[PDB]
Design a protein around this ligand. Structure first.
Ligand SMILES: CCCCCCCCCCCC(=O)OC[C@H](COP(=O)(O)OCC[N+](C)(C)C)OC(=O)CCCCCCCCCCC
Ligand SMILES: CCCCCCCCCCCC(=O)OC[C@H](COP(=O)(O)OCC[N+](C)(C)C)OC(=O)CCCCCCCCCCC
Ligand SMILES: CCCCCCCCCC(=O)OC[C@H](COP(=O)(O)OCC[N+](C)(C)C)OC(=O)CCCCCCCCC
Ligand SMILES: CCCCCCCCCC(=O)OC[C@H](COP(=O)(O)OCC[N+](C)(C)C)OC(=O)CCCCCCCCC
Ligand SMILES: CCCCCCCCCC(=O)OC[C@H](COP(=O)(O)OCC[N+](C)(C)C)OC(=O)CCCCCCCCC
Ligand SMILES: CCCCCCCCCC(=O)OC[C@H](COP(=O)(O)OCC[N+](C)(C)C)OC(=O)CCCCCCCCC
Ligand SMILES: CCCCCCCCCC(=O)OC[C@H](COP(=O)(O)OCC[N+](C)(C)C)OC(=O)CCCCCCCCC
Ligand SMILES: CCCCCCCCCC(=O)OC[C@H](COP(=O)(O)OCC[N+](C)(C)C)OC(=O)CCCCCCCCC
Ligand SMILES: CCCCCCCCCC
Ligand SMILES: CCCCCCCCCC
Ligand SMILES: CCCCCCCCCC
Ligand SMILES: CCCCCCCCCC
Ligand SMILES: CCCCCCCCCC
Ligand SMILES: CCCCCCCCCC
Ligand SMILES: [Cu+2]
Ligand SMILES: [Cu+2]
Lengths: 147, 241, 382, 148, 51, 147, 52
């Protein structure tokens, strides 16, 4: 199984409440009892959530921002980012037991979007992605890689 | 864990594609914001694409994100295409919007609202980076190349728009005629920070002097943004937001 | 359309448009419609807006549905920014050519260096046809006629596609091999020095040399073809000829002005002084893109927009003809639904309750004298 | 501020208290302190409490300054009570042109001067709080230098 | 210019467009004092509770 | 005894000379031979000196500064601060054998008082006060506290 | 008009004439609100005794 087809697939305030709450209320309490296969399965879903973030940012910060220049999406990617924060903080191990500084900057910067200074904070995706790579190479690091 | 060697390679390939997707789109969004709110005014209009201010400003504020992305990607994976993926993503977003909103919603002509080309600058910055992997050598030589080749890079596109025309008793360029004809309600003529002449410009040197000044300022901005990207590449584990 | 949002007093006393006339109301594609008239820069220019030392004559329309073929201030073409003097009167003429079918609100706007857009009154113009029939020919000094609708479009597409293809080829070349995790592990666990080796360096040298060489030949070809090029033309034009209006013989001094809150009426008291040798009668009160007319005195025949026109919205308590030399005090009331439709009654929310406008005085002969009034505007509640 | 207003602005000089009253910030301090201790996250504080401080400033002072905004016809010109007070009680060192106040703009749409300014102040206060948290963090060091 | 008398006799009346006459010497003074004292008392109560 | 009633209780240049000299000339040479009771007794006096500093700053920076706005104390709090510097550096232990950076910033910043930048240096009172708290909890730390 | 064409040391040569400021002053150059009457020569080979 591993990666599934989730990749292909007032209200803003409301949608944030359930989406953030649902991931947080269903939190895995025994993060120690994770098989690496189950870790790898859930690990893809976290990357899928970041994929939704990337689509939301591009739709939000690239399409609609200059659309004002020719002359919703900001809360949309705000919700996606914060939901994925609780998502990885609870489901993915090695990413809990401490807030990741780059990933926190990633979720806060574009959220509080002066835009030039604050659009720079989206560069934290690089540190986020290398941290998620280290999470990738925890149990399913090899072999093949480095061999 | 993971079962065997080949399916592990397949998993790594899937991760590669997904990471490429996420990095590409996040860079598109952020770099598009930065270019829009630092330089987008000059990139919008052909009559705005002057030879002093546009050439001076665009490389200075457009080398920001490629510097950081290069400093991260090279140092962490030996991938010499950060500047490339930044420029291609910016051009993709710019062109999609030019064709869907500037020409779809409104009806500004494409030859009037075409964006600027930066692929040669990205290519030079990426080669001078990987070849002679010295970051200082990169910031010295590749930044100069990026600054210098910008205007000659766009010369094939904008050269046909500089043909002199006698328009109702006044000499005008094709870009000037396009700007005069197709009205811009929010962008009048006086806002155009373009070459208006000076008593201290000697002979035919407006384009080269501006190009060299942009090259040096791009060296400085690259040197700054390399360190900004180096921190944007940390993996700090804070324990109390 | 960007008005009914700008500051009330700022619209009232910035620039007054009058004598406006539209050549046509309905046009087809490639037809030309001309907008004429005169605009007067107010003497009491607001401090928060910079003086029109550098200003542009623009047209307010929803996108380039009309192409601005020509524009004149006085008698000379004004394609670039111009300098306007405070208190002087100018006349303008803008030639517009239809490009997009449909109904458009064409506004004759003014743009000043440090004050943003100054929207004037607009008239609905209907355009019929199709965009495909539109043509924008122009003849260069080189001796060739090209259409600006598609000139250089093919060359721009070709060059942009070529550069994008070069970038895509580079990224694909470096993305054929495994990208992220194995390479990260190699560079972390000891020196990598295996991910960048021949012939990667040689092909990178090839890419760099090819990019430079293509750029050089492309710049030399763009120098051979189109060998005559000029830089972009810019620079504010000074010495703009103003209209030499005769000195008005009518002196008007305003003794307070009030308007009802809420209400649609503007009440004010006037002391008209009549000089010369003609019996005049007040006929119009143009305050901000709204013309309050007295039907018994003057009637509008210039096709001025209905929503901006008050046929009998101006009521004068004593509008009997005024003998020359004779001075009298009269009460003038201007009431119309447009006063609230365009939110001229929101000046109570404004931090500067002052108004300015133009009064048109007509005599038996039929000619008119233009006089200007300004006074504090005091709202009334009880 | 109040001791000086009552002892020098009103004692030495004679500017009226209703003319020289200071601004109120206790609601902002209270919000900043609750949003801090509750959800002790400093980032959450800098995001939410700073927004509250910026947003509640003008509505906090509205009960005090509202009576001073009653329109008055003063010798043919519309004036506010605060404007009349400033016109009457002279300030030798502070003429009228120095007043960096709302003078109108051609890019202010409808009734939005107070809210837009309040939100801009809230965001800038977020930024200033984020900076001054780190400035205070260093101002809190206990370094033992050995050679001034 | 010599001025004789006392400050207590000074009056500064003004009539608003609402239809009320108020003296600018003490207009809104009581309201300002009340609001400032209330907010200061709230702050003092908070600091005393935590002290 | 402990805390006494000292709490209730050209010339500027001259007063600085004796006040700074007197505390420095009477310096305790054997700082090792201090009973904790004697340390605690002298420790209150150092806090009393800081109390004089706080009164001087408020009288100097709050009353007289805006008094110019309506239109001595600066040297007064300069003298108090520098005198208390030698005072704690010589009398109080654990505060000698090295100049405290925050307390030095405290005594220098308001002294050289552009005022906006330099009024910020008075925030070093926080680090000064926590250092003086650590001096408090040297010998007479308990018990009671932490028990 | 130039008073003399060839002069010896310590001799005085006077330059007279009229200059007209153009109405259409370019925007990129500030208006001559603060201007100086100077003389362009390769170094102080002539000392500017007077200027009116
Ligand atoms: C790693 C380093 C990469 C360098 C990339 C440079 C590509 C080649 C462009 C040459 C242009 C030139 O020399 O010609 C100068 C002219 C401008 O002259 P002008 O006075 O404005 O008059 C107009 C003359 N027209 C009508 C023929 C254009 O060209 C340009 O429009 C571009 C000028 C800015 C770039 C200057 C680069 C100088 C070489 C740098 C490397 C040593
Ligand atoms: C943790 C967050 C704490 C938030 C504290 C805010 C307290 C409530 C104030 C509401 C004011 C309002 O909505 O009304 C808007 C009006 C101003 O409107 P105006 O266009 O200038 O016209 C004048 C209209 N008068 C005559 C009725 C005043 O009010 C004000 O004068 C204050 C405006 C700035 C503050 C905006 C806060 C918006 C809510 C923020 C939380 C989601
Ligand atoms: C608006 C700007 C945001 C400011 C940034 C501050 C947050 C950054 C750090 C962060 O996200 O951590 C908070 C937690 C992560 O777990 P912890 O911080 O370890 O604490 C968990 C317990 N807690 C849920 C009560 C916090 O994450 C969550 O638990 C969030 C999910 C629960 C919230 C759902 C309710 C919100 C509905 C609107
Ligand atoms: C109209 C809004 C619809 C949003 C639907 C949200 C779906 C629920 C979120 C979620 O928890 O996971 C959905 C998928 C699959 O991950 P799951 O495995 O279901 O997540 C929990 C992981 N666990 C099973 C091991 C405990 O994870 C994903 O990758 C789903 C990505 C959805 C894109 C984000 C849409 C947000 C729009 C505002
Ligand atoms: C505006 C230009 C960019 C400025 C960026 C400055 C970042 C400085 C580093 C940082 O995040 O500060 C961390 C501290 C909290 O630290 P602690 O809670 O002590 O965490 C222990 C581990 N750690 C010391 C290694 C972090 O501070 C905090 O309390 C966290 C503050 C919130 C950080 C995330 C948002 C950043 C927005 C720019
Ligand atoms: C204007 C904005 C604030 C800037 C504050 C900068 C403070 C930087 C840290 C500092 O005080 O510098 C210390 C050095 C002398 O060091 P050393 O004598 O090597 O002391 C050994 C122990 N130590 C390295 C941990 C300090 O430097 C010195 O020589 C001491 C300089 C005087 C410091 C006290 C006055 C500060 C006024 C702002
Ligand atoms: C004006 C701006 C001041 C610049 C800041 C530099 C001083 C900051 C560091 C400091 O206060 O240390 C000097 C001593 C503390 O002991 P040490 O610095 O360890 O050296 C003691 C021997 N010494 C008195 C000759 C210096 O403290 C003293 O001994 C001061 C008391 C003796 C001076 C009394 C004479 C002054 C009369 C005007
Ligand atoms: C007109 C000026 C009169 C200033 C009088 C200065 C008094 C002498 C300073 C002094 O050394 O201590 C006075 C008191 C009590 O502390 P002492 O115990 O007397 O100080 C030495 C400590 N030792 C006995 C263990 C060796 O320590 C204090 O807390 C006295 C605080 C006085 C307030 C500061 C006034 C400065 C005004 C410029
Ligand atoms: C203007 C560029 C300054 C760059 C600073 C580099 C600091 C690196 C610290 C690791
Ligand atoms: C102006 C550039 C400064 C970049 C900051 C980098 C800090 C790195 C510390 C690890
Ligand atoms: C603009 C991004 C620079 C990041 C600031 C560096 C602060 C890190 C200190 C630990
Ligand atoms: C603009 C705010 C910058 C804050 C820098 C934080 C650095 C902390 C280092 C410990
Ligand atoms: C602009 C805010 C910078 C604050 C400096 C804090 C430095 C802490 C180092 C321990
Ligand atoms: C404005 C106060 C910031 C203090 C400067 C931090 C420097 C400390 C380096 C050791
Ligand atoms: Cu309109
Ligand atoms: Cu006028």
């Amino acid at each position: 199984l591993l990666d599934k087809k989730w990749l292909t697939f007032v209200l803003e305030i409301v949608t944030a409440s359930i989406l953030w709450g649902y991931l947080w209320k269903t939190r895995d309490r025994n993060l120690a009892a994770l098989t690496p296969r189950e870790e790898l399965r859930r690990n893809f879903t976290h990357l899928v959530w970041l994929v939704a973030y990337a689509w939301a940012i591009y739709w939000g910060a690239s399409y609609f921002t200059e659309q004002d220049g020719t002359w919703l999406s900001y809360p949309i990617y705000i919700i996606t980012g914060f939901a994925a924060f609780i998502y990885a903080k609870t489901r993915l191990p090695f990413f809990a037991k401490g807030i990741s500084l780059p990933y926190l900057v990633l979720v806060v910067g574009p959220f509080m979007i002066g835009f030039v200074i604050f659009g720079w904070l989206a560069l934290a995706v690089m540190g986020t992605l290398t941290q998620t790579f280290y999470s990738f190479a925890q149990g399913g690091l090899g072999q093949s890689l480095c061999e | 864990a993971v079962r065997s060697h080949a399916e592990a390679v397949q998993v790594s390939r899937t991760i590669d594609w997904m990471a490429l997707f996420v990095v590409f789109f996040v860079i598109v969004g952020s770099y598009h914001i930065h270019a829009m709110l630092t330089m987008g005014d000059w990139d919008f209009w052909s009559d705005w694409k002057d030879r002093r201010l546009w050439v001076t400003v665009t490389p200075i504020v457009l080398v920001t994100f490629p510097a950081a992305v290069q400093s991260y990607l090279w140092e962490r994976y030996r991938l010499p295409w950060g500047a490339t993926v930044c420029v291609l993503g910016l051009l993709l977003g710019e062109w999609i919007n030019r064709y869907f909103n500037f020409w779809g919603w409104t009806y500004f002509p494409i030859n009037f609202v075409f964006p600027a080309s930066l692929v040669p600058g990205a290519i030079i910055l990426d080669t001078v980076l990987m070849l002679s992997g010295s970051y200082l050598f990169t910031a010295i030589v590749g930044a100069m190349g990026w600054g210098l080749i910008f205007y000659p890079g766009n010369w094939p596109i904008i050269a046909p728009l500089h043909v002199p025309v006698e328009y109702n008793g006044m000499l005008m360029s094709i870009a000037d005629i396009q700007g005069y004809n197709y009205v811009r309600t929010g962008t009048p003529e006086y806002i155009r920070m373009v070459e208006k002449g000076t008593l201290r410009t000697f002979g035919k040197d407006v384009a080269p002097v501006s190009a060299f000044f942009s090259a040096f300022m791009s060296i400085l901005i690259y040197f700054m943004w390399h360190f900004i990207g180096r921190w944007f590449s940390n993996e700090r584990f804070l324990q109390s937001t | 359309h960007g008005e009914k949002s700008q500051a009330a007093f700022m619209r009232m006393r910035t620039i007054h448009w009058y004598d406006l006339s539209w050549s046509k109301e309905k046009v087809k594609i490639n037809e030309t419609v001309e907008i004429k008239g005169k605009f007067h820069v107010f003497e009491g220019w607001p401090e928060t807006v910079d003086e029109p030392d550098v200003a542009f004559l623009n047209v307010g329309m929803p996108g380039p549905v009309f192409i601005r073929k020509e524009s004149y201030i006085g008698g000379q073409l004004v394609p670039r920014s111009v300098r306007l003097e405070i208190g002087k009167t100018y006349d303008f003429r803008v030639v517009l050519k239809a490009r997009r079918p449909g109904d458009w609100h064409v506004h004759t706007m003014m743009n000043v260096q440090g004050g943003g857009p100054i929207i004037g009154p607009g008239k609905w113009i209907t355009v019929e046809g199709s965009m495909s029939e539109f043509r924008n020919p122009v003849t260069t000094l080189t001796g060739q006629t090209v259409d600006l609708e598609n000139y250089n479009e093919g060359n721009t597409y070709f060059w942009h596609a070529f550069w994008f293809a070069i970038g895509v080829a580079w990224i694909g070349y470096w993305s054929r091999r495994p990208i992220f995790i194995p390479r990260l592990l190699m560079v972390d666990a000891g020196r990598a020095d295996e991910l960048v080796s021949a012939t990667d360096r040689k092909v990178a040298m090839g890419f760099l040399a090819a990019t430079i060489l293509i750029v050089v030949m492309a710049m030399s070809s763009a120098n051979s073809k189109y060998p005559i090029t000029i830089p972009l033309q810019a620079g504010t034009m000074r010495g703009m000829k103003p209209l030499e209006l005769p000195a008005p013989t009518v002196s008007v001094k305003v003794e307070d002005a009030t308007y009802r809150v809420p209400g649609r009426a503007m009440r004010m008291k006037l002391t008209i002084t009549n000089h010369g040798n003609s019996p005049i009668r007040l006929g119009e009160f143009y305050t901000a893109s709204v013309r309050f007319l007295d039907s018994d005195v003057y009637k509008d025949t210039t096709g001025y927009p209905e929503d901006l026109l008050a046929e009998d919205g101006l009521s004068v308590s004593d509008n009997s003809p005024l003998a020359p030399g004779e001075t009298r005090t009269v009460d003038v009331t201007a009431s119309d639904a447009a006063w609230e439709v365009y939110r001229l009654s929101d000046i109570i929310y404004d931090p500067d309750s002052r108004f300015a406008g133009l009064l048109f005085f007509f005599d038996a002969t039929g000619n008119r004298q233009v006089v200007q009034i300004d006074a504090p505007l005091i709202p009334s509640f009880m």
